[PDB]
Amino acid sequence: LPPLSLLDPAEVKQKSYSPESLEAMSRLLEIKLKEFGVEVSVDSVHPGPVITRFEIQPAAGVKVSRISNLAKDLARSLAVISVRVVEVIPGKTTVGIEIPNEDRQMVRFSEVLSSPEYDEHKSTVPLALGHDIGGRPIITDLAKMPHLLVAGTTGSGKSVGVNAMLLSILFKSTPSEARLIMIDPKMLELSIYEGIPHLLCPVVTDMKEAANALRWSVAEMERRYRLMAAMGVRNLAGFNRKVKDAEEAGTPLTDPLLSTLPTIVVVVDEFADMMMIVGKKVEELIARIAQKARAAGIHLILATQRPSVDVITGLIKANIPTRIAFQVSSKIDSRTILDQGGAEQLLGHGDMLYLPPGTGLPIRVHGAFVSDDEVHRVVEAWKLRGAPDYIEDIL
Template sequence: ASGGAAAIAEAEGDTNAEEPVDGQQDESDSELAKLIERTPEDPATPITVAYPTPSEIEAADEISTPPPDYSAAQRYPWHLPDPGMLAVARPGGITQEEIDRTSSRVVQSLAQFGIDVSVDQVRQGPTVTMYGLSPGWKGRSEESTGQRVRVDTILAREKDIALALASPSLRFEAPVPGESVVGIEVPNSHPTEVTLRSVMDAPEWNEFTKTAALPVPLGLGSGGEPVMADLARMPHMLVAGSTGSGKSVCMNAIISGLILTRTPLELRLVMIDPKRVELTPYQGIPHLYTPVVVEADRAVIVLKSLVEEMMGRFRQLEGAGVKNIASYNEKVSERMPYLVVLVDELADLMLTGAGEVERLLVRLAQLGRATGVHLVVATQRPSVDVVTGLIKANFPSRISFAVMSQIDSRTILDSPGSEKLLGRGDMLYMPIDKPKPSRVQGAFMNDREIEGVVSAWESGTRPALPELHVSFDDSDANGSTSSSSDSDSLFDQAVDLTRSQKTLSVSLLQRRLRIGYPRAARLMDELEDEGVVGAGEPGKPRPVL
């Protein structure tokens, strides 16, 4: 038996795993989709995990590539961008007078139906304010009945309370976790703006980034507290919401939070953006392990390459005799960076080949945690043919923005509530360690902030970083190979670009040719060798000769 596989099993807490189910996958798919095992990550939160068998590791050896070489990048003094470039939120909120008036209306509207309650708790958030109702003991006769008002009686009067408050949407939480009250979330008349800086300026965030491997700022909670998460502990996240609900803004906040706190030595990103507009602004950052993928059929090939990369990481763990990436980085001098895969619009990928896409995503989700591979997948169509049962089972942490129906909410969260959200970043967040979702106002980022974060990483001359090894078949329709013909085509495009420029920078090559930093840096060296551009000074563009 392989020592690496046993170590990985221990790292995942798999001490009583069931035997793998045989005969449920086609033989041609065996390298990617067999031996799925189920084991509890936490007694209260079961998730699907798996680990590779010795035969799978040996099979992967036949198609293996050398581990990425980060020796040159380790000698470079990486500096994180200053989060002070981010926008400061404008003040907002509601007055105490409005809180008192709303509390009185809630109590009076229920009293009309003989329901005795008192408002014992108020938590003001940026978008909604939660009023905690304590059921009383009085009936219609205003005398004590000796029996407390039933919670179901309060919940049945939702529409009457909404009418009294002239509110378009109310959300009940009965009971509030850890409290003996029934919570009613009422939209604020003047919502408070929440920006990414609102979270990153909090003292809790600074402490959190010291211990979390992959810190992610999400927004502010229903009580105004900063909400953050460690993606390494999630370990994968599913994000869903209808058009305009704030889903893509959430993806931007996740990416920016990661690259503002982690260098390319600690984190590499793979972005898949079939919509071509949401993630492409990050094309120039050095964290990219491969250029932003915009073709759905090419995305499938990249996912296959990520599975091979993951198996290669297992071999590295096995060689070092460790259980997971955290232990590996403590033991060896050349750290293994975490690898985060972001997919913005799963539905487009599922149209390309639902079975294969599902199998690859599930494979990465089942095996990725020990090797530092984590997934963030977003979709605006949370139907069962997109968010399949197998995908949902392997993405235990979920975020739901406003959706059209209660059915969509149940598809994402296994509970209703998302259909009552207000949009514009209003979300329900359900992490792996919480049985019920909590309400959060997502952090907002505008295009100027995104450009500032990207520009901070684009500036300056940096060493070339390893790229993901992508193996394309001869029949690949994209023709996006690493062959000499492709290199010649890129070189010719770079020469054409210089004809309209007085100076040329690596970041300009990245943006215009839609390539990653390593390839753009190699192109710049080729242009210098051919006498097209001159020698440059560190941090400055090259002169065109």
């Protein structure tokens, strides 16, 4: 493994908003809402790295729409870009407001990696995104997403975040555990990974070329299920601990129709062009893999740069419930990606809303800005481990 190294050293910064200015801002919000038609009793504040969490206890006899209508009008009065209104807090009576704070940090990727939590994720394929509004690290497991949809209107970062998750895959893995396959619509950035010993094929450019890789993934999932049902065990992890306990002291088993089958990751940069060139074959193959991929260990990470309903359909929302949406410029698109609304009121530069598997409670996650420098440093530090071994039956 590459050690905790080649990262940017998290520089010394100390601008943590001492409660003099915070109390001043709280009384300022109380006045600037009292100017409008609401009465507000501010209760407690959670200051953070990017925004500042507030807790309004509103007075007797006032709704929440009398806050949520005037998000724009309050936003032109607090010297911010756009404030965000949280309409339900877990377990308290308050009504949340997240003010943009006009001196932010870039969330260092090392600060995400140096958590105790990242050293304690047991799974081989984690997803290190960043900190939340409290500044606590938010790391998710890709084996229980089971898939992922990425938004963003060339806004905060849509390339970054994909690069971030991929480099976070690379820092806790081996090529005998997790090998990826990318499909590149615009051969711009992720034609940089060529040369690593976990990359099953070179870069894919054409959508008509990419359909061969998708059908390769479908065929690999099918023989994966044939191999699993020939071994009785349900999913992949139980099968790999079975092959551990089988060939531990030496008890051979090859050709059941042999090592751990790797957790294959398929990633897509620009899904919009993939539908726009090939309209029908791709979307049905994506829903096919989204149906039967979770048990097989094959996974899919999608990413659209347009949040239209032409791209995101019910067929893509068939089996990928976990959503990551960055800043988008449309409340209609805010309810396109998320089943909730409000994802237009974000700030940019690595800001995402994380929507977890299943339950409707949108986590706000500040993604870690990782440079191209660390990308093609970790690529070079990783090319020691071998050669880009290929299975050319993918095409």
